[PDB]
Amino acid sequence: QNYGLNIPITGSMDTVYSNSTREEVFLTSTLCLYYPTEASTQISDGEWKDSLSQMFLIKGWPTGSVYFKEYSNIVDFSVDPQLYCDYNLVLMKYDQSLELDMSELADLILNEWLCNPMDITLYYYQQSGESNKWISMGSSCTVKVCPLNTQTLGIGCQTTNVDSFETVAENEKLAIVDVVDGINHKINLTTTTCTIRNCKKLGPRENVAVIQVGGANILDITADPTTNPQIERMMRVNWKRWWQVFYTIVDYINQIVQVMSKRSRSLNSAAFYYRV
Amino acid sequence: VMEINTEGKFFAYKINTFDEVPFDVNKFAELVTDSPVISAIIDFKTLKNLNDNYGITRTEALNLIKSNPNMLRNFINQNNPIIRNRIEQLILQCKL
Amino acid sequence: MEVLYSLSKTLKDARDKIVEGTLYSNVSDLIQQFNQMIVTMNGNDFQTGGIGNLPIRNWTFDFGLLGTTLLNLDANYVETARTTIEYFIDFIDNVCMDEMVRESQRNGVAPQSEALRKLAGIKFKRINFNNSSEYIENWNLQNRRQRTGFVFHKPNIFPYSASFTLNRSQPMHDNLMGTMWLNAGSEIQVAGFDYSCALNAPANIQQFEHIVQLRRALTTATITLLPDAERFSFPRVINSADGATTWFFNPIILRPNNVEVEFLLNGQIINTYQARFGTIVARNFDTIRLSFQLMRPPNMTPAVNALFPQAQPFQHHATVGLTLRIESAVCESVLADANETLLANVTAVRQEYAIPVGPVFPPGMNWTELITNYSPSREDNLQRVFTVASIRSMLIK
Amino acid sequence: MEVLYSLSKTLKDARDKIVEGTLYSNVSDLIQQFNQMIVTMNGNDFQTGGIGNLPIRNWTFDFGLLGTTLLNLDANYVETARTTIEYFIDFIDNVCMDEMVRESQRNGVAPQSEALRKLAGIKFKRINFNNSSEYIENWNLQNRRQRTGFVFHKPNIFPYSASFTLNRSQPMHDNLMGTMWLNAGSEIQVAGFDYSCALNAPANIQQFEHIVQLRRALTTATITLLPDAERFSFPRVINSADGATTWFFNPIILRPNNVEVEFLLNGQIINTYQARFGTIVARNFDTIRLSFQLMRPPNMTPAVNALFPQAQPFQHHATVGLTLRIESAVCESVLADANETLLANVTAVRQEYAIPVGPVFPPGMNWTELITNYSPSREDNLQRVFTVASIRSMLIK
Amino acid sequence: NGQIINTYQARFGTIVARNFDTIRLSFQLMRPPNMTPAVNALFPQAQPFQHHATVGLTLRIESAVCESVLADANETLLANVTAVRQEYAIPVGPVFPPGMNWTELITNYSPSREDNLQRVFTVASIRSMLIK
Amino acid sequence: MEVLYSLSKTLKDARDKIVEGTLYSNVSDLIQQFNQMIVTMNGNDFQTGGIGNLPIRNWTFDFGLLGTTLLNLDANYVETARTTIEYFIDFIDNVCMDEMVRESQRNGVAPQSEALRKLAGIKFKRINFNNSSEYIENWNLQNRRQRTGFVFHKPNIFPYSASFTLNRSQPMHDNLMGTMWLNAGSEIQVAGFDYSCALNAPANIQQFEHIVQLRRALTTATITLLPDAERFSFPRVINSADGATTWFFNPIILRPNNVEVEFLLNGQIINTYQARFGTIVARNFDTIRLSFQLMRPPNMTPAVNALFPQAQPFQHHATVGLTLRIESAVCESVLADANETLLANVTAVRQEYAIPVGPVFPPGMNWTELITNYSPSREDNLQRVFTVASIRSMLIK
Ligand SMILES: *[C@@H]1O[C@H](CO)[C@@H](O)[C@H](O)[C@H]1NC(C)=O
Ligand SMILES: *[C@@H]1O[C@H](CO)[C@@H](O)[C@H](O)[C@H]1NC(C)=O
Ligand SMILES: [Ca+2]
Ligand SMILES: [Ca+2]
Ligand SMILES: [Ca+2]
Numbered sequence A: 001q002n003y004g005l006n007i008p009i010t011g012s013m014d015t016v017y018s019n020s021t022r023e024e025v026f027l028t029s030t031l032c033l034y035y036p037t038e039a040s041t042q043i044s045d046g047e048w049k050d051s052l053s054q055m056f057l058i059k060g061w062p063t064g065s066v067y068f069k070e071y072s073n074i075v076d077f078s079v080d081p082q083l084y085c086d087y088n089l090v091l092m093k094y095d096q097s098l099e100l101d102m103s104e105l106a107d108l109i110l111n112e113w114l115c116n117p118m119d120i121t122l123y124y125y126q127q128s129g130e131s132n133k134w135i136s137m138g139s140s141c142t143v144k145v146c147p148l149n150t151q152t153l154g155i156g157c158q159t160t161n162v163d164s165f166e167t168v169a170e171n172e173k174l175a176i177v178d179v180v181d182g183i184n185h186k187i188n189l190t191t192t193t194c195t196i197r198n199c200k201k202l203g204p205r206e207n208v209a210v211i212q213v214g215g216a217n218i219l220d221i222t223a224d225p226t227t228n229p230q231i232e233r234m235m236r237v238n239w240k241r242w243w244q245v246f247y248t249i250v251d252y253i254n255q256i257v258q259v260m261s262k263r264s265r266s267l268n269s270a271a272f273y274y275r276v
Numbered sequence B: 001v002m003e004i005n006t007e008g009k010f011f012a013y014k015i016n017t018f019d020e021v022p023f024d025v026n027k028f029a030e031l032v033t034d035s036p037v038i039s040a041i042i043d044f045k046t047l048k049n050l051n052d053n054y055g056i057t058r059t060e061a062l063n064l065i066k067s068n069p070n071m072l073r074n075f076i077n078q079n080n081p082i083i084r085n086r087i088e089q090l091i092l093q094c095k096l
Numbered sequence C, D, F: 001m002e003v004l005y006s007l008s009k010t011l012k013d014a015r016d017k018i019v020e021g022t023l024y025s026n027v028s029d030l031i032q033q034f035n036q037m038i039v040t041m042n043g044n045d046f047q048t049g050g051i052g053n054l055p056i057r058n059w060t061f062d063f064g065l066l067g068t069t070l071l072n073l074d075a076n077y078v079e080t081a082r083t084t085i086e087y088f089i090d091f092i093d094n095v096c097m098d099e100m101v102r103e104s105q106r107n108g109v110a111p112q113s114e115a116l117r118k119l120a121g122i123k124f125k126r127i128n129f130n131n132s133s134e135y136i137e138n139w140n141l142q143n144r145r146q147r148t149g150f151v152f153h154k155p156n157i158f159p160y161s162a163s164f165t166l167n168r169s170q171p172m173h174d175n176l177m178g179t180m181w182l183n184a185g186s187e188i189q190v191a192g193f194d195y196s197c198a199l200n201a202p203a204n205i206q207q208f209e210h211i212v213q214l215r216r217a218l219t220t221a222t223i224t225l226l227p228d229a230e231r232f233s234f235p236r237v238i239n240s241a242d243g244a245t246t247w248f249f250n251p252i253i254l255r256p257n258n259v260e261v262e263f264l265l266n267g268q269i270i271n272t273y274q275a276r277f278g279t280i281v282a283r284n285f286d287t288i289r290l291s292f293q294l295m296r297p298p299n300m301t302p303a304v305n306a307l308f309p310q311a312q313p314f315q316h317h318a319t320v321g322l323t324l325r326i327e328s329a330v331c332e333s334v335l336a337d338a339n340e341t342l343l344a345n346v347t348a349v350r351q352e353y354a355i356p357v358g359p360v361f362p363p364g365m366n367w368t369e370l371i372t373n374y375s376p377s378r379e380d381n382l383q384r385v386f387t388v389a390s391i392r393s394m395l396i397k
Numbered sequence E: 001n002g003q004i005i006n007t008y009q010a011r012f013g014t015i016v017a018r019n020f021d022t023i024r025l026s027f028q029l030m031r032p033p034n035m036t037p038a039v040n041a042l043f044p045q046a047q048p049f050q051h052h053a054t055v056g057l058t059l060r061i062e063s064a065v066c067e068s069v070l071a072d073a074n075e076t077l078l079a080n081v082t083a084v085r086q087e088y089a090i091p092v093g094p095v096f097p098p099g100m101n102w103t104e105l106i107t108n109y110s111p112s113r114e115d116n117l118q119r120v121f122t123v124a125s126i127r128s129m130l131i132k
């Protein structure tokens, strides 16, 4: 075991590839559904988690492997969403004016962000390149960024005057702020309430899928405006009844799990790179 | 001798008798990294024309090749029209 | 075996030159050779076959000498000649079949097939006629320690090998980079691919190398080098190296740049060709290093810019390839060709009579497994069986 | 040259025919030839080499004759003949190398290599044995003006060139039309591509033409014509003509309709084939005119209809291909081949001893330049050097 | 063949090309630095351009020596052959163009055509020794 | 070359046997041989040298025959013997040096050194005396193959290679497991190490395997096998595989259990030994497979228990090793030894005169590279120069 080394591997093309693995990824892994509370409110039941578990058992997943999680709504779930769970689905209802919040959450939970803390009070923070953002999470994240000249003097804003700063997020629960990569900035953000992390984007998180339960293709995980990729795991399904939505998920759970994959950073094989 | 113009044109030619030979790139590219390059104030074309019209000797041919001024002055003293024409060509090419 | 070749040559000349109407001046020397062969073989006895289904056959020679008084060959002559020639052709065919089915770990070049061992004796030295064909000439020039050479057109020097090396990979197999290659026959066909199109490589230039170690040295090889390896130039899905999953390959072919083809012998660069396609020449070489590069296009049309994004998805994967065809070459140890029938003839006569799988040759004479490890015992046995195959093919087609 | 080939022929025949046990009837004529060679070359001094790194070797001949009173050859005869034959073989090899390494701007056909120039004298006219080989026979048939011919397998006549022309284009490179083509050795592969799939062309057909002029007439050539040029039938990114920006290519391979191939000699149409693929023949042709057409298919299934819109994008580009391999031919002047090894021999001998780039041949004897520019002087020198290479290859491999 | 055999710069009148296969003429149009007002009126700075400046060169090959045969303005070999063909209405042959048209006979002058031309020219000289 | 050896043998026997007071009955045959040598070499001219700093020299022979009318040799006879033999010895020395300093990629067996080439004529076979030495005898046998073999004492068949592989590793190199080895000369020393003492191995047994691929088969070899590889039984710090960092190594030497050593030829096992130490034999082997194991000791005294914890730190790293000396063997091809100075003589002759590096041998006769790449051309040239040095050593030391 040669952890922490890029070692090339040679593979032939005459080799007969092996048998299926769905039975393994069901008998071992743990499916994990995150739904909004309005779902259960419309269902109006409470044996229904057990009923869904039994149907998943009919479909293959053992009894204890399928686990359910609730959340009040997308904006509240946005603050520190940690899916400590093996195969994640996030049902995400779509409503007008929450397009950007939905996109931010989709980016955050679909792409593996590795990140470091930020002392707003002390340093001036600069963004390296295309894959670096600052994510601010809290109850009221009012980030006020003031850019700095090469002499460390403000433009459009006075370092001693918080008012003239340029706001780029008001009272957001989650905010992926992207600034002009190449300039020092002085931030102010309400340190008692909202934490901020200088984060950058590793490869994708291939363990979490997002089922947009509502409308059109509005998710934009890539902050770049030129590219609007349609990832395999940003699924979208129409809805008029949460029972029908859940039945669709249960019926096609094989396909959703095929779309997803085991988390790379959770593997033992990633031990000495960024294993998590 | 392997000679190059700054505008692509290239030649290769013996010293004793200026009969040009097929150029050898990937030999010139290797040589020029290390060897002592020589400016070509007497271009290969004018040099060949001079040799054909006048018939310089081996020593004068080598000195013209190496742009030795001690000997290049001798032709301009002689009023050699080929070298004259070339040198006024450069002086008139020094416009702007 | 030289005596066996002499028998084959003199019977071939008997079948060709002795025809109805010929001057005897045309066939005087041949008739003298034929009569010498008849006298030497007369009174002897041979046993042939007895391995596999090849039946045991007894040969006893007692034949009348061909006449020599005739000025001009008539139909009476060729009838007697034909009667003797048919028997001799059958005998040589069976001896060659026996010798090219037999096999031996130790002392391969020595003759097996006790009929041929008898023919190697002292009585049958007088039948040595001439040794002009390429295979017997190499046999003699190698029996006496002198350099030998076989000219080959499309020599299948590479064992069949289709595979790939991944210098960067993930379980999702979404951002790969490495090389793929098929080496088969006289074809090397290698394609280096990069999913990010050298986005983060130093100076936006990915570097690819491919070694190919010939099992035996080649000489005066005429080679055909082209870009854009056509095999690895269409979409695929490929089973993973482990064999668990399968990954998607969707090539878009960039041009390979500053390609260097280095032909090596004992680790010393014998020849180097930088960005010189078309036909090329390798004077003598034992290994091939093909180095090429995937340089990101600095300037880009909007379409190609859309092809190559800065993000993760990478719906298209850049690729640059080379193809190298050994059109012809010269080698010491015997090989198989697209122009000679000796490998096929030996394999056919082995398959005919169900010869059991022997010590040195692989089962069924799989040439890939024979060439992948090419021990000196295998080389000796292969030269022996190929020489007998040519000797037999000189008469039996 | 004729004397040199005769020396090589008699030495090869002495190495083959003169073996132990052979009847004297089989070697009488060759022994007389060998004796005359010994007598005429006795007391003569040659000096080969002296250019590049080829060592300067002095040759002096003092050799005894060969017997005639034997009936069957034995070890003594063979041993003496072997000692003499090795010396002559080395001498001939060095003479051939000396003649191969040299060139001459004027008077190419006449000999170089003062050793061979001495051989050309009246004193050595008695050595000529028989000029059987194809190269020497053509040497004679051209030395006295008659109709020669060399038969070639895959004659690499076309100089390497992969390129394209654009009959409609614009800096965004979204709507192109034109042809791509790769000529390499014996194979042409031409693909006419239209990005609009002939939307506005007359009758929805776009005409493509590709004229390739050979540098030598090829007589009685068998050709394999097929559709769907392989190398231009997959996505690429290609430079601009000026090299500024790269443009995407994304072919969908329509078939070529009413395809004509015209084989032309001196402008006149010699042969013409009309939508007839497979094996074809060309009596003579100095040039080939491949004409074909991309016809928009009138009846489009919904899928292909989606592929080909009337709007601007044109996300997929229609193409129609042709591939054409000269499987064999006959030419009045020498060329490299996939079967022969003459070019390989010559280039290898030059590279071994680092002969400086000479007057006529390009550096490294690169066939692409050597066939792109094929002046009569270059042709004459190539024929001389190839004949010498064949003479060498008779004995040395 | 890319071999600069001769170069004559700023020379007119008779010259000698010892041996050659291509002629590479080069010249230049230099705008007059000074101008009489007539010439100034000829050449304006504006667009109309009533008068168009030109430079020229004539190059006549007086005599030459060619390895192969060629028609010439001295002997009547080509005329003799073409006359013999036209007088008797010989159909078109394989190699020669129709009518022995010299222009397309020399644009494409392959070795077969060249040797046939040599044969007919030698025969025509032989004939002209007797019949004129 | 047989003639050259015969010269050296007759000169050595003349210098030895022709001494004062010796009976003529002791030296009659030797005097006859010497007189044949004199008559054969008389009236000739040789030239030797002209490469590197080895200067040109010219040898001319006009010597009188030794007397024969003497019953018992006296002093005045041996002085004439001196005046002849010293000159002859000098001539032989320079011929041998000239032959050693030359090379040829092709047909290396045939003599270089035009002096020796002249000696290889027909007038000089009468000097052939007797070919008794091992090298000349094997030269004859190889040049007309019977099975041959040079007996070597402690032959340096391996190339100098010390290296290591890690089957388990971390970037901080806290917990390693793998093998280290040094193959040098006739010594293989291989030590497999585990930093956890096979704590988590299956059944607390860790399996180590090492493969050594001889460049040429060895026959009737004697191998001394012992445990405890010496070179890897003290603390070290080793540069990493990438070379970025260095990792500490702190052996604690456990014994190797169920050690197996398999000697294979062409892939099949020829000999196999298990837990056998001391001297052993290898019949005919081309590869060595040394398998051994690191078994965690079940019962552990307090001290060893303190040594081996179950936590990561692992201040002490368990290792088990083997040492293997090929004391003597028989090789069909030639190799350097520790008992024979042939390689030393060849290298010294090349070095003293600063010969330009030729096509075949590596720079400075670097034996490690030479045995690493030991192609047949290189082998033939090596055998030629070694037998020439063997001839030279009979007279010059
Ligand atoms: C794979 O499945 C086939 C039938 O689908 C079965 O015969 C075979 O044993 C299986 N192999 C493995 C390794 O499970
Ligand atoms: C941001 O500005 C407010 C003024 O409303 C100030 O009280 C607060 O301290 C500032 N934040 C930080 C982190 O200094
Ligand atoms: Ca938000
Ligand atoms: Ca402001
Ligand atoms: Ca940014």
Ligand SMILES: [Ca+2]
Pocket (backbone or CB within 6 Å): A220, A221, A222, A223, A224, A225, A226, A227, A228, A229
């Ligand atoms: Ca976007």
